Design a protein around this ligand. Structure first.
Ligand SMILES: [Zn+2]
Ligand SMILES: [Zn+2]
Ligand SMILES: [Zn+2]
Ligand SMILES: [Zn+2]
Ligand SMILES: [Zn+2]
Ligand SMILES: [Zn+2]
Ligand SMILES: [Zn+2]
Ligand SMILES: [Zn+2]
Ligand SMILES: [Zn+2]
Ligand SMILES: [Zn+2]
Ligand SMILES: [Zn+2]
Ligand SMILES: [Zn+2]
Ligand SMILES: [Zn+2]
Ligand SMILES: [Zn+2]
Ligand SMILES: [Zn+2]
Ligand SMILES: [Zn+2]
Ligand SMILES: [Zn+2]
Ligand SMILES: [Zn+2]
Ligand SMILES: [Zn+2]
Ligand SMILES: [Zn+2]
Ligand SMILES: [Zn+2]
Ligand SMILES: [Zn+2]
Ligand SMILES: [Zn+2]
Ligand SMILES: [Zn+2]
Ligand SMILES: [Zn+2]
Ligand SMILES: [Zn+2]
Ligand SMILES: [Zn+2]
Ligand SMILES: [Zn+2]
Ligand SMILES: [Zn+2]
Ligand SMILES: [Zn+2]
Ligand SMILES: [Zn+2]
Ligand SMILES: [Zn+2]
Ligand SMILES: [Zn+2]
Ligand SMILES: [Zn+2]
Ligand SMILES: [Zn+2]
Ligand SMILES: [Zn+2]
Ligand SMILES: [Zn+2]
Ligand SMILES: [Zn+2]
Ligand SMILES: [Zn+2]
Lengths: 172, 172, 172, 172, 172, 172
């Protein structure tokens, strides 16, 4: 038991470790998406840049959780970072749809972590999740939904013109 | 009777109060339109920004009328601000068409207020309406007509590509 | 159902729409108060400025709720904005008392919205209300109570000297 | 009953007064520690500076609680500030250990105040404690644990060389 | 016996410790007064600011005595800081009267400490008290007397107008 | 077959994918080390900063390989990123020893990739590895060897004083 540990349940500590893994996994998914759009037979550079930026941001989200774990006197336990489900992400629209799905799963995990905090009467953890994670999730999901809608309305994925113009005018 | 009141007919005072309400109503219509384009299943941010700017401007038009009322020694009498006719505004083109209709109704009201000023021999009121309202109305109506024309010519509302490109290249 | 909607109860969505209306109503009350103090037979310009600033701020509070509604995938449903209870607000002290009453009612509404968030296990909504609304309400209520106290202690509303000096030295 | 008081339980008001006292007590403990390290037969100036900075900060924490009490319409009731348990704090390591103990007790008090807020359905108070107090406590406890660990690992308290070097390289 | 101790009587050391407590007590009295004027049913912000500034200054006076104690090789012995005599300070005038009384008591203590220095042939202590304390006391007492006189002459405490105007024009 | 692919052997493409994984693994190892030194019972902040910087750099090394893969018309195939061998890294010296071992393994992999380039007559790949990877590896290995030597010579790992001073004077 850490000299700093106070009001920090074992289940909370465990849930923080699972969340660290999931943020790293999200970082990996976006890394994979980024370089998909970098392929010469896809060649959408702003989609590539956009997803690379999200990949780095996910990694910072994981790091903030690792910091929290140590702050509370928990012990970080790392697990393998699983490869993403896809190697080929099909189209800008499909990637955006997949990202939306991803972010909703990450949000679901964060909402379960928050429920756990409530159940264990851990308001420091409640605040950490509310302040640093919940609104970032809502913003990300809204942004991704907006992107999906625009791409669909423009005629993606069948219209390569649509994806090209979106890459320049929204992601550019 | 106000110590400042001079050459200010009761009918003029009443008409100014109705005009205050109508400007507020216009502010509300544009507010509703703005957040329609902010929906995740619409997602046209510059349409949203454009209509939000018009909403604020309408509110300032109402405030200038309230100032005029007090300047002339009239008494402001506020009425409910009615919700707009629509909750769902359908498409960028439809919203622009509705705005054009709105502005022509506001203009018609202002032209009746001006006729009243003429009929009551109130040149201060004539000048107020001519200087601050009539050309703003003509400019707004011309701008909205231009937007409707472009959107129609581009293939809106069936072309979501059209609305997307207009949002970037005209409203952006 | 919105593609972005997650953990967002229908009752929460409905309560957000009622809160949007109430913020707009508060904007209207303060607008009415502002121009009351602008009357030539009242003529307290800093009271007028103070209430106009609050009117604009209320409108921004309503806009932030409309943004939240769309962020969460709810659907904004606007209602009429009711005219305020008063046309004539009597005195600076009376207006401040009325504002205090208003803000306590808005606070009560926000506390019920927060209870609903708790009851529906919606920590994103809890955070939104806590972060953006609850302390603003406490600050507003404390400020208005301070103003009421000063005005009473100075001899308002019977002392027009008192209201005049307060307008210059506190609201100026 | 204050004109501003709303949703503010008597038990919450009482708990805020006890917390004000405890913050003042913490300010006193750190003041005592600071001047201990200022003694000619101790003579660790950065330990002295570090604890003096914490003493001032505690006093500001107490002041923010007094502000909150008045904001909510509670009534501040001050109690004696008890002298610290020690006059002689022994060594840098011992002082850091004592500070760690202190901060964990302050944290425990804040967690009980937060539980009370939950129990009384006072989300404004929940937010105040979460936003302004809980993470400051976690940060302080982590920092103090880090200092204790370094000092122990360096050979303190038996190594005066260790305390000297820590004073320069960590607290300097 | 400290290696630095020279010409420093035990009675002087003891008197310095009592003076440290009294300065801390004065800091507490002013802290209590400050937040009294911050109450929503008092609401004199410059009285609040003025007394808060004095509270901080008293704390610095206590710190300078603790520094002196260590400089001379004495040993600081802290005592409880007693709560002030009042929770409710009644009016600006009454608070100023109480402050005047306080400062005259602090001055009396400092004059006894100076007599002790003379009696023990401790010119370093004489100089410390003369240079850093005696004229600050005379200035504080004169300032407080001036404030009391103005407030009385303006019609305080019965005139809340008087206290309001003094807060703006003297303490503002 | 990519339209851009030229002189790029399938075995080279495969080896680049394995190298991408190994760089990611190295990023993970350093991430784990970084937060180990961030623990309250380790508390060496510059060791933590140093390893965090290496973690980010490894991630950039992986990204440059993914860019190369696409440049050459190869297809990126991601694999799981394995958790590091250790959860607890024991001491600064042990972590540095482990890092040295890691970097020598990464170097061995890069030397095999270079041999493959030679064997497949791929001078573009030879140049890529020589220019961007081989000297970075030699520099990293030399730096880590220097750190190990200093730490051993200072008395690490038994001397916590040694690790503390190294953290400040070399990694600070
Ligand atoms: Zn994330
Ligand atoms: Zn990072
Ligand atoms: Zn796997
Ligand atoms: Zn994410
Ligand atoms: Zn919570
Ligand atoms: Zn909470
Ligand atoms: Zn919060
Ligand atoms: Zn208008
Ligand atoms: Zn305005
Ligand atoms: Zn209606
Ligand atoms: Zn208009
Ligand atoms: Zn005319
Ligand atoms: Zn004319
Ligand atoms: Zn003209
Ligand atoms: Zn509001
Ligand atoms: Zn706005
Ligand atoms: Zn009505
Ligand atoms: Zn309000
Ligand atoms: Zn809540
Ligand atoms: Zn919450
Ligand atoms: Zn504190
Ligand atoms: Zn302060
Ligand atoms: Zn005691
Ligand atoms: Zn503290
Ligand atoms: Zn809470
Ligand atoms: Zn809460
Ligand atoms: Zn003093
Ligand atoms: Zn100080
Ligand atoms: Zn006592
Ligand atoms: Zn004093
Ligand atoms: Zn003397
Ligand atoms: Zn002398
Ligand atoms: Zn004046
Ligand atoms: Zn590498
Ligand atoms: Zn990168
Ligand atoms: Zn594995
Ligand atoms: Zn490396
Ligand atoms: Zn070669
Ligand atoms: Zn070569």
């Amino acid at each position: 038991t850490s000299q700093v540990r106070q009001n920090y349940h074992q289940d909370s500590e465990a849930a923080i470790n699972r969340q660290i893994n999931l943020e790293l996994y999200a970082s990996y998914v976006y890394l994979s998406m980024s370089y998909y759009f970098d392929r010469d037979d896809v060649a959408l550079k702003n989609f590539a840049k956009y997803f690379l930026h999200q990949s780095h941001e996910e990694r910072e989200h994981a790091e903030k959780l690792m910091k929290l774990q140590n702050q509370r006197g928990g012990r970080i336990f790392l697990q393998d970072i699983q490869k993403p489900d896809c190697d080929d992400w099909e189209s800008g629209l499909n990637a955006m749809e997949c990202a939306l799905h991803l972010e909703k799963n990450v949000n679901q995990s964060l909402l379960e972590l928050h429920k756990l905090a409530t159940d264990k009467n851990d308001p420091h953890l409640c605040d950490f999740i509310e302040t640093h994670y919940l609104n970032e999730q809502v913003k990300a999901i809204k942004e991704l939904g907006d992107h999906v809608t625009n791409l669909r309305k423009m005629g993606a994925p069948e219209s390569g013109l649509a994806e090209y113009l979106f890459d320049k005018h929204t992601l550019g």
